[PDB]
Design a protein around this ligand. Structure first.
Ligand SMILES: *[C@@H]1O[C@H](CO)[C@@H](O[C@@H]2O[C@H](CO)[C@@H](O[C@@H]3O[C@H](CO)[C@@H](O)[C@H](O)[C@@H]3O)[C@H](O)[C@H]2NC(C)=O)[C@H](O)[C@H]1NC(C)=O
Ligand SMILES: *[C@@H]1O[C@H](CO)[C@@H](O[C@@H]2O[C@H](CO)[C@@H](O[C@@H]3O[C@H](CO)[C@@H](O)[C@H](O)[C@@H]3O)[C@H](O)[C@H]2NC(C)=O)[C@H](O)[C@H]1NC(C)=O
Ligand SMILES: *[C@@H]1O[C@H](CO)[C@@H](O[C@@H]2O[C@H](CO)[C@@H](O)[C@H](O)[C@H]2NC(C)=O)[C@H](O)[C@H]1NC(C)=O
Lengths: 103, 96, 119, 48, 97
């Protein structure tokens, strides 16, 4: 029947509508978890030359540089390797260079 | 439009988030990484077979801060002089 | 003629269908290569004020920064198998002061070697 | 990526099928049913 | 029958796409002979590169020879079968609508 075909078409319309709604929902979740604004997420940006800049503090945990990784710093700037109330130990086998708060 | 904006912001190329890749262990960074704000760390254990470096165009002012962010001991490797400020110095041997 | 009217109506329905299909394909892609979680992208977490990472972030290319810190409750350690080198350079990029921890015993190379008190 | 995204390229063929179907909604079955007067032509365009 | 004709059409289209992508990939790999295998790597600006290992291959010519011929034959057959399924659907709705 034309009425029944129309009703199944309405069911198709409804399922497409809800599919689009959940697509928009998950897209909002993607937008919000990375905390993206009109400029972008408040984490980082990809400079067009390939330079991965960041925007705020970083907690990198362990770091294992593998290949061609020289920890440097910006031009006319000072590396300030400070341990916030913690020692700093340059270790190699037995050899130790320990810079504690008072020794 | 919103998804194309996401793809433009994060630069979702064919191979992942630009040069950055995310794997089981963690971040694998196939590009340079210059950060504007101070980073944090827990260890830096370079793999055997390479020499971990520290470089700059200026002084390397290793220092320590108390809870009040006041300097107690300092080790400034500059261009001309290598100063070790602090309350002491020591050189020990293995046996003590 | 309601005929071609209905025809173009569900032609537009077809166009909306294809746009929805391609949008779901792109969003499944955007979920897959991102390892996405409510905590954040990947296995790390991009928090409000920063981003916490619990994994071995192997940088296959150089790094740059201005201030390298350690956590308040954990002591920074930095070790290797051959040696660890601190370097500093002049305006012409000439490394002039080295604090090298070699395999056996420390070397300091410079034009001067002071020691002072805190004052 | 190749197992996910190229699964949508077939929707382009789906469009092509839909278009070529819709350019023929009366060319599919021109005779249709009730085929009377099947050897002549009956049409008018001028009021008399 | 209409449903399976459409399914054969979509499966053949997917096969066409995968075969075309694999051929486009294999057009841009440089491969060398490894012990009872082949190591096919891609040129890169950086000295590092990603490689692939094809085991149980005496000479890489089998990958650069009969393999791409097989891909071409596979994609030709897949496009022909997809056309057959599509025109089967075409006649079905030309007799059905
Ligand atoms: C501290 O550790 C580093 C890294 O292990 C040592 O640097 C290494 O030095 C050796 C000896 O020169 C290098 O081998 C040869 O180097 C020359 C360049 O001078 C090169 O042309 C040869 O092909 C060969 O590689 C080795 O490459 C080099 N490693 C790196 C990563 O640069 C350094 O010697 C160690 N310090 C001491 C006192 O041993
Ligand atoms: C980088 O390291 C070098 C070497 O330690 C620093 O150079 C020294 O810096 C101190 C403090 O700025 C200078 O002391 C100054 O002496 C003058 C009198 O000459 C006095 O009027 C000032 O009030 C201050 O006490 C010292 O002369 C200078 N020595 C040399 C050889 O340069 C440099 O300051 C460090 N730079 C940074 C940005 O940390
Ligand atoms: C650095 O300061 C800490 C905190 O004072 C020292 O730890 C203790 O300090 C008190 C008072 O100074 C002493 O009575 C304890 O004997 C110290 N305990 C230990 C285990 O040392 C620490 O000794 C100081 N380090 C140096 C090198 O002076």
């Amino acid at each position: 029947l034309r009425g029944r075909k129309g009703n199944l078409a309405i069911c198709v319309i409804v399922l497409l509508f809800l599919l689009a709604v959940i697509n928009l929902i998950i897209t909002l979740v993607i937008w919000a978890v990375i905390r993206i604004g009109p400029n972008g997420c408040d984490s980082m940006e990809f400079h067009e030359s390939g330079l991965l800049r960041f925007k705020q503090v970083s907690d990198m945990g362990v770091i294992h540089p593998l290949y061609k990784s020289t920890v440097g710093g910006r031009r006319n700037e000072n590396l300030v390797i400070t341990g916030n109330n913690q020692p700093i130990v340059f270790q190699q086998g037995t050899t130790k260079l320990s810079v504690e708060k008072n020794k | 439009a919103m998804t194309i904006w996401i793809l433009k912001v994060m630069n979702f190329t064919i191979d992942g988030m630009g040069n950055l890749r995310i794997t089981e262990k963690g971040l694998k960074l196939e590009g340079d990484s210059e950060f504007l704000q101070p980073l944090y760390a827990k260890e830096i254990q370079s793999r055997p077979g390479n020499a971990l470096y520290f470089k700059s165009a200026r002084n390397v002012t290793v220092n320590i801060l108390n809870d009040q962010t006041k300097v107690l001991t300092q080790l400034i490797t500059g261009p001309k002089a290598v100063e070790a400020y602090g309350k002491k110095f020591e050189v020990k041997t293995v046996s003590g | 003629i309601y005929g071609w009217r209905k025809r173009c109506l569900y032609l537009l329905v077809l166009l909306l269908l294809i746009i929805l299909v391609v949008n779901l394909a792109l969003t499944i892609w955007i979920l897959k290569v991102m390892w996405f979680s409510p905590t954040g992208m990947g296995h790390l977490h991009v928090t409000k004020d920063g981003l916490r990472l619990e994994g071995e972030s192997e940088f296959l290319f150089p790094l740059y920064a201005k201030e390298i810190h350690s956590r308040v409750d954990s002591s920074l350690l930095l070790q290797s198998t051959q040696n660890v080198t601190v370097n500093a350079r002049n305006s012409d990029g000439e490394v002039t002061g080295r604090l090298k921890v070699g395999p056996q015993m420390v070397e300091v190379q410079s034009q001067q070697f002071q020691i002072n008190s805190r004052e | 990526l190749h197992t996910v995204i190229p699964a949508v390229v077939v929707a382009a063929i789906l469009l092509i099928a839909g278009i070529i179907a819709m350019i023929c909604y009366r060319k599919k079955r021109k005779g249709k049913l009730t085929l009377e007067d099947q050897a002549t032509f009956i049409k008018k365009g001028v009021p008399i | 029958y209409f449903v399976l004709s459409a399914l054969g059409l979509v499966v053949c289209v997917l096969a066409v796409a995968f075969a075309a992508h694999h051929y486009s990939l294999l057009t841009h790999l440089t491969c060398e002979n490894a012990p009872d295998s082949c190591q096919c790597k891609l040129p890169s600006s950086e000295p590092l590169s990603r490689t692939f290992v094809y085991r149980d291959v005496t000479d890489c010519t089998s990958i650069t020879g009969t393999f791409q011929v097989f891909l071409l034959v596979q994609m030709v057959l897949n496009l022909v079968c997809g056309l057959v399924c599509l025109v089967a659907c075409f006649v079905m709705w030309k007799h059905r609508y």
